Amino acid sequence: LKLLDNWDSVTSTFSKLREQLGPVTQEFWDNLEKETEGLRQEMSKDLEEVKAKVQPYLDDFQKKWQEEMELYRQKVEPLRAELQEGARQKLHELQEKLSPLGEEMRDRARAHVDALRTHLAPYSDELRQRLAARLEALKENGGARLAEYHAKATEHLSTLSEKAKPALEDLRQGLLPVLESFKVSFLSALEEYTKKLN
Amino acid sequence: LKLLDNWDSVTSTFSKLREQLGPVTQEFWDNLEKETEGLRQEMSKDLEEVKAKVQPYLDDFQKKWQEEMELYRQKVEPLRAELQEGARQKLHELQEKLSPLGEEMRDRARAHVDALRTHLAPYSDELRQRLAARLEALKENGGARLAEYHAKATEHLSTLSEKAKPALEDLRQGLLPVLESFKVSFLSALEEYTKKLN
Numbered sequence A, B: 001l002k003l004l005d006n007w008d009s010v011t012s013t014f015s016k017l018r019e020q021l022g023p024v025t026q027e028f029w030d031n032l033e034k035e036t037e038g039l040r041q042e043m044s045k046d047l048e049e050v051k052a053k054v055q056p057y058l059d060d061f062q063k064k065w066q067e068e069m070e071l072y073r074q075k076v077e078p079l080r081a082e083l084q085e086g087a088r089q090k091l092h093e094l095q096e097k098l099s100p101l102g103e104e105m106r107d108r109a110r111a112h113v114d115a116l117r118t119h120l121a122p123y124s125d126e127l128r129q130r131l132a133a134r135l136e137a138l139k140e141n142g143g144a145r146l147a148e149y150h151a152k153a154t155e156h157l158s159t160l161s162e163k164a165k166p167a168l169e170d171l172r173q174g175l176l177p178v179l180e181s182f183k184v185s186f187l188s189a190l191e192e193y194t195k196k197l198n
């Protein structure tokens, strides 16, 4: 009944709060209408003064922008022309290097790679010998390792049998009384929770 | 009470592990003997070849580095002067723009700033007129609201205390027997818990 009892107190509070909400909304709206009224009168200024002023305000910037664009247009031509001349010369000068020095670089790269290719020829072959040498060792040693690993695995399993059979059996035999004790304790606990919490 | 039994079986499994460790380490060391020597057989011809691999490779690389470095002096060096001259030209080009157009842009800024002096400044003063009215409304409406908030505070405090008295009274009234009831359940719970967790 505690929940329903306190529920009444909440409901009565809500009732009186709702009774207050009326005057509150009335006063709030009444005052809001005043604030909005001031803003309504302000509208004939904040929006109207700026509407009349928006003409010369935008006009000033607009005309200046026109001049700025005109000035930019009168300069964009010679500027682009100079940049064009500069680019032409600078790029032509660059091409004067990208061609001969470029080809020379390619020719040098030929010898660079050719020497590398020539060096890598016996290198790769000797690397094959290295691989074969390592492979032989790793194969012979690997075969021994596999055999050893197998023996180890066998013995590991042999000793694991002691855990799979004796240890497991012994543990299971010890778990049985544990489960029995657990079941009792669980039953007791279940009853406790049902007696005091239900 | 079967902790000793459980530990006993675990001790035996540890003993079996020790029984393994003996031969296992012995053969593992014999394995390592093959692995170390095997790796040494691979590493001997490896390191001995490294001398006859890194040296000639470094030689070829040094020659390549020397060639590349020479090419830098036959490319990067002259191009540095060309790029520097090109930069000097571009700088001149830029200076012949940053100066005249700079003064132009600076004058444009003056035109905009002076405009703002007749745009923002006066508008700010006109804004003061609006702010005066806005703040006036906020002061008037706020003053009325302040009184309303005060009255609402009393109307809220009266209702709060109106509920507080019977609420606290009933709460304490119900808390008394509820606490006693809780004591009974708490006691009976703990008393039985001690019997279960004995």
Ligand SMILES: CCCCCCCC/C=C\CCCCCCCC(=O)OC[C@H](COP(=O)(O)OCC[N+](C)(C)C)OC(=O)CCCCCCC/C=C\CCCCCCCC
Pocket (backbone or CB within 6 Å): none
């Ligand atoms: C149907 C539904 C029913 C629901 C239940 C209804 C019944 C509820 C039952 C009781 C209600 C009252 C509970 C108790 C209120 C205690 C108020 C209080 O005054 O208690 C103060 C004490 C700390 O005393 P002191 O400082 O003087 O100690 C030191 C003093 N000297 C310095 C001498 C060192 O503290 C405490 O008792 C409380 C423990 C410490 C609190 C530390 C401050 C925690 C603040 C916020 C926690 C926010 C958690 C959630 C965050 C969400 C984030 C998203």
Ligand SMILES: CCCCCCCC/C=C\CCCCCCCC(=O)OC[C@H](COP(=O)(O)OCC[N+](C)(C)C)OC(=O)CCCCCCC/C=C\CCCCCCCC
Pocket (backbone or CB within 6 Å): none
């Ligand atoms: C439909 C249902 C809607 C919801 C209904 C909710 C009903 C809630 C009913 C009851 C409130 C329950 C929660 C009460 C929480 C505590 C309130 C309080 O009583 O905390 C007072 C403390 C006094 O501190 P002390 O130093 O004396 O002791 C310090 C002691 N120690 C060590 C342990 C910190 O305050 C402090 O500790 C430090 C902070 C003090 C701040 C004071 C600020 C005063 C000015 C402006 C704040 C206005 C906030 C208005 C919030 C809305 C109100 C309607």
Ligand SMILES: CCCCCCCC/C=C\CCCCCCCC(=O)OC[C@H](COP(=O)(O)OCC[N+](C)(C)C)OC(=O)CCCCCCC/C=C\CCCCCCCC
Pocket (backbone or CB within 6 Å): A017
């Ligand atoms: C010192 C203390 C003294 C006493 C103070 C008392 C203050 C009382 C004030 C308000 C009482 C509120 C009572 C609410 C009762 C429960 C209403 C309700 O139905 O709870 C459940 C609903 C629906 O579930 P949910 O959405 O919560 O969860 C959705 C979870 N999902 C995401 C799964 C689906 O909740 C909803 O519908 C969403 C509800 C959102 C409510 C927002 C806050 C409304 C309060 C005021 C509105 C503004 C008033 C002023 C306006 C000024 C304008 C200029």
Ligand SMILES: CCCCCCCC/C=C\CCCCCCCC(=O)OC[C@H](COP(=O)(O)OCC[N+](C)(C)C)OC(=O)CCCCCCC/C=C\CCCCCCCC
Pocket (backbone or CB within 6 Å): none
């Ligand atoms: C709080 C801290 C961050 C503040 C960030 C903002 C700071 C600046 C102040 C305000 C900026 C507000 C920006 C967001 C505006 C609302 C955007 C929106 O998404 O709103 C959605 C809602 C709900 O509908 P929806 O989501 O589907 O919106 C699209 C469909 N739709 C037509 C029917 C609304 O929209 C609605 O509820 C109804 C919307 C009706 C809008 C009427 C606009 C009339 C235009 C001018 C009126 C006269 C102005 C005179 C000068 C006044 C100067 C102060």
Ligand SMILES: CCCCCCCC/C=C\CCCCCCCC(=O)OC[C@H](COP(=O)(O)OCC[N+](C)(C)C)OC(=O)CCCCCCC/C=C\CCCCCCCC
Pocket (backbone or CB within 6 Å): A156
């Ligand atoms: C200490 C070792 C046990 C000692 C007692 C038992 C000894 C038993 C006999 C010999 C011991 C052998 C130990 C090594 C066994 C390696 C087995 C193995 O095959 O290895 C490789 C596998 C690889 O994956 P896969 O088998 O799926 O094959 C691939 C499957 N395909 C195709 C999806 C992706 O490994 C895996 O699988 C996942 C392996 C995850 C192992 C987690 C071990 C966590 C143990 C301790 C953590 C904390 C260490 C630090 C403690 C500090 C205390 C102060």
Ligand SMILES: CCCCCCCC/C=C\CCCCCCCC(=O)OC[C@H](COP(=O)(O)OCC[N+](C)(C)C)OC(=O)CCCCCCC/C=C\CCCCCCCC
Pocket (backbone or CB within 6 Å): A113, A116, A120, A123, B053, B054, B057
């Ligand atoms: C001392 C100790 C012992 C020795 C240790 C070192 C041993 C080294 C032995 C071998 C290392 C081999 C490394 C490379 C392996 C992959 C070889 C390969 O199969 O490569 C194929 C590419 C195919 O190109 P593609 O024109 O047919 O495809 C054109 C595709 N589409 C249509 C976009 C443009 O061959 C190409 O790209 C080449 C043409 C493109 C070149 C791009 C720039 C390369 C930068 C510098 C030159 C480096 C030269 C030396 C090798 C550097 C390898 C990073």
Ligand SMILES: CCCCCCCC/C=C\CCCCCCCC(=O)OC[C@H](COP(=O)(O)OCC[N+](C)(C)C)OC(=O)CCCCCCC/C=C\CCCCCCCC
Pocket (backbone or CB within 6 Å): B064
């Ligand atoms: C023996 C050792 C000799 C070393 C010689 C070094 C200097 C070599 C000079 C010239 C010849 C070698 C040039 C090597 C670099 C360019 C290689 C190249 O031809 O690449 C071509 C690719 C083409 O891509 P795509 O757009 O056609 O396809 C995009 C879409 N997809 C992925 C799927 C294809 O990429 C591109 O063309 C974009 C290339 C952008 C420029 C890259 C320049 C890289 C060169 C040096 C950078 C070094 C940085 C060092 C930082 C650490 C310093 C301590």
Ligand SMILES: CCCCCCCC/C=C\CCCCCCCC(=O)OC[C@H](COP(=O)(O)OCC[N+](C)(C)C)OC(=O)CCCCCCC/C=C\CCCCCCCC
Pocket (backbone or CB within 6 Å): none
């Ligand atoms: C690709 C190959 C290109 C080769 C040619 C490259 C040419 C350009 C290379 C370098 C030019 C300088 C780059 C910046 C170096 C900053 C160094 C530094 O350590 O500077 C610290 C100052 C500390 O100032 P403070 O107030 O503590 O002390 C009072 C002022 N003090 C420092 C000088 C006593 O830092 C400050 O002053 C912060 C304010 C700095 C204002 C600088 C205004 C310069 C004039 C116009 C602005 C231009 C902006 C361009 C933006 C990028 C456009 C693409």
Ligand SMILES: CCCCCCCC/C=C\CCCCCCCC(=O)OC[C@H](COP(=O)(O)OCC[N+](C)(C)C)OC(=O)CCCCCCC/C=C\CCCCCCCC
Pocket (backbone or CB within 6 Å): none
């Ligand atoms: C409908 C409701 C109407 C108004 C009801 C007012 C009474 C409310 C009644 C009970 C409590 C309401 C809820 C109060 C919540 C308090 C939370 C709090 O915990 O507050 C204290 C903590 C202290 O933090 P601290 O000491 O570690 O740091 C201090 C940093 N430092 C020095 C800037 C001082 O504040 C902080 O944590 C950081 C934030 C501190 C904010 C302080 C704001 C002070 C502003 C005005 C004070 C007005 C006092 C008179 C009010 C009369 C109302 C009628």
Ligand SMILES: CCCCCCCC/C=C\CCCCCCCC(=O)OC[C@H](COP(=O)(O)OC[C@H](N)C(=O)O)OC(=O)CCCCCCC/C=C\CCCCCCCC
Pocket (backbone or CB within 6 Å): B064, B065, B068, B069
């Ligand atoms: C960590 C990664 C950094 C990446 C940087 C990328 C941009 C590099 C920019 C320009 C090119 C490099 C320009 C390097 C200019 C170096 C100028 C210079 O004096 O550097 C001095 C440092 C000294 O290091 P220390 O550790 O000895 O001392 C540090 C000192 N105490 C401190 O307070 O830090 O050593 C160094 O900084 C580097 C020493 C290099 C030695 C070999 C120099 C060899 C010279 C040329 C190389 C030719 C290669 C040709 C072949 C190319 C491939 C084909």
Ligand SMILES: CCCCCCCC/C=C\CCCCCCCC(=O)OC[C@H](COP(=O)(O)OC[C@H](N)C(=O)O)OC(=O)CCCCCCC/C=C\CCCCCCCC
Pocket (backbone or CB within 6 Å): B190, B193, B194, B197, B198
């Ligand atoms: C009347 C009860 C009726 C039944 C009730 C059943 C439900 C009970 C549920 C809750 C009630 C208890 C609620 C207890 C709440 C405890 C809250 C608490 O104290 O938090 C702090 C403690 C602090 O421990 P400590 O001081 O050791 O650690 C300090 C820390 N190292 C440091 O640097 O300062 O944290 C710890 O102690 C954690 C480690 C503890 C180690 C020792 C743990 C010791 C545990 C048992 C002791 C041995 C029992 C042997 C068997 C007895 C029965 C046969």
